[PDB]
Design a protein around this ligand. Structure first.
Ligand SMILES: C/C=C\O[C@]1(C(=O)O)C[C@@H](O)[C@@H](O)[C@@H]([C@@H](CO[C@]2(C(=O)O)C[C@@H](O)[C@@H](O)[C@@H]([C@H](O)CO)O2)OC)O1
Ligand SMILES: [Mg+2]
Lengths: 221, 217
């Protein structure tokens, strides 16, 4: 099972530097070029650069936009990829992906990124890392709609789950909105009225940047 | 190398055919390998990009017949024989002949039958009030098309300040939208009034859908 996992993301101050890592497993690391790809919120994918496999001498190439600013390296003993980011600006606020690139020297070779990490959001702002508050949404027939209103968190993102991911059906999560330097989103789930409150309904709001999880049990008025 | 995609976005109904363009400033034909180094990726909302076509026309393990990649040189195309609910995504082309360059993307949306929203209203929570905050939330669920309007009325009077609006991505199963409208007051503004009304206006009707509650309940 091929795995690509990004880390190091979060809030970083303008002018500063950040190092990202990309743990891997499930394939012969040194057989593959590895690439980094970034994506500003609501924008297109942008290739940043790659590092080549062993056979090619692990040489690096970068895109015009990031030359002299971003740097790629690899720990071949631990199968970890790295992205060194210097002198960050707001324009660098994006989700950063690591992707397995080609292996032209051994085994199957084709031109494509077969596997990607889940990506890590980097946001460059002088502001303050503040975990969100999670408020319940409950009514004042056969179905009932509930949810959690998530306000005052920074930076992005937050993810919301229900019943620790067991309740996946009828979930709607609106996009975030930014106001007065803070984010908020609300997530709702519709269930059969025979399910609640007779049974338990909980949302799990996760805010990576503060390494925080809030659980909120949805109770009747 | 410069990659240019087209159209930036389009909407078709389930079952319809679609064509997306991708153009590069230089040929992507590699004379040594004799293959075109262009790939198509699919990125669904909140998800990582996934490979569909590589070498211009070769479909990746798992991808259905419905997707076909054509073209050679500097002019390429992604075709979806018949679009389905799963296809909601931005589609990116990527040259890999000289390093790698992504196109700007094509967002694929689905046209579908108009549907009216189910509208709910939510009074503030005690724990938020406890902290001196009062968020009232009107939820509009599973409607189409996307444009929709909510008017807030407090004690019969229209309120416009302190209102935030947010949509979901088009749903991957029924292709609908939902949106929340939130009015945010201080615990003190809120306890100064009783009737809280949100009216939802949509093309599915002349008459707005109205949901209300009284703070004194
Ligand atoms: C001709 C240039 C390189 O040839 C060699 C090399 O000299 O190292 C040897 C060849 O047999 C072959 O292995 C090629 C590689 C080159 O791959 C890249 C690259 O590493 O720069 C990336 C690849 O995605 C593509 O961009 C090619 C490009 O189409 C031609 O250089 O370059 O074959 C994969 O390397
Ligand atoms: Mg070199």
């Amino acid at each position: 099972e091929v795995m690509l996992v990004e880390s190091g993301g979060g809030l970083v101050q303008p002018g500063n530097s950040l190092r990202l890592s990309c743990a891997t497993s499930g394939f012969t690391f040194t057989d593959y070029y590895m690439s980094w790809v970034r994506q500003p919120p609501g924008k297109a994918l942008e290739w940043l650069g790659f590092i080549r496999n062993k056979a090619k001498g692990y040489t690096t190439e970068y895109s015009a936009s990031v030359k002299g600013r971003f740097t790629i390296s690899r720990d071949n003993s631990q199968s970890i990829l790295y992205l060194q980011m210097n002198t960050l600006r707001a324009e660098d606020s994006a989700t950063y992906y690591c992707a397995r690139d080609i292996s032209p020297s051994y085994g199957v070779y084709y031109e494509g990124f077969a596997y990607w990490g889940q990506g890590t959001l980097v946001t460059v702002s002088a502001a303050t890392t503040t975990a969100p508050s999670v408020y319940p949404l409950v009514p004042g027939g056969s179905s009932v709609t509930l949810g959690c209103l998530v306000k005052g968190y920074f930076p992005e993102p937050v993810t919301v789950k229900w019943n620790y991911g067991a309740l996946s059906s009828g979930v709607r999560t609106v996009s975030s909105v930014l106001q007065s330097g803070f984010y908020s989103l609300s997530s709702l789930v519709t269930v059969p009225s025979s399910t609640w409150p007779s049974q338990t309904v909980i949302c799990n709001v996760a805010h990576p940047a503060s390494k925080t999880e809030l659980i909120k049990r949805i109770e009747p008025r | 190398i410069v990659m240019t995609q087209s159209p930036s976005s389009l909407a078709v109904s389930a079952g319809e055919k679609v064509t997306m363009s991708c153009k590069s400033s230089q040929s992507l034909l590699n004379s040594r390998t004799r293959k075109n180094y262009l790939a198509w990726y699919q990125q669904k909302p909140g998800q990582s990009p996934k490979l569909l076509i590589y070498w211009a026309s070769t479909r990746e393990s798992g991808v259905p017949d419905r997707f076909t990649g054509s073209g050679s040189g500097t002019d390429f195309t992604l075709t979806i024989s018949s679009v389905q609910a799963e296809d909601l995504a931005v589609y990116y082309c990527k040259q890999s002949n000289n390093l790698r360059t992504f196109g700007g993307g094509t967002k694929l949306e689905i046209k579908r039958a108009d549907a009216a929203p189910t509208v709910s209203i939510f009074p503030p929570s005690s724990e938020q009030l406890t902290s001196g905050g009062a968020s009232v939330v009107c939820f509009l669920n599973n409607f189409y098309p996307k444009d929709i309007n909510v008017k807030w009325k407090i004690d019969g009077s229209e309120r416009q300040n302190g209102v935030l609006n947010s949509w979901t991505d088009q749903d991957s199963k029924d292709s609908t939208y939902s949106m929340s409208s939130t009015l945010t007051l201080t615990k003190d503004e809120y306890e100064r009034h009783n009737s809280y009304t949100c009216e939802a206006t949509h093309k599915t009707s002349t008459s707005p859908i109205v949901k209300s509650f009284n703070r004194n309940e």
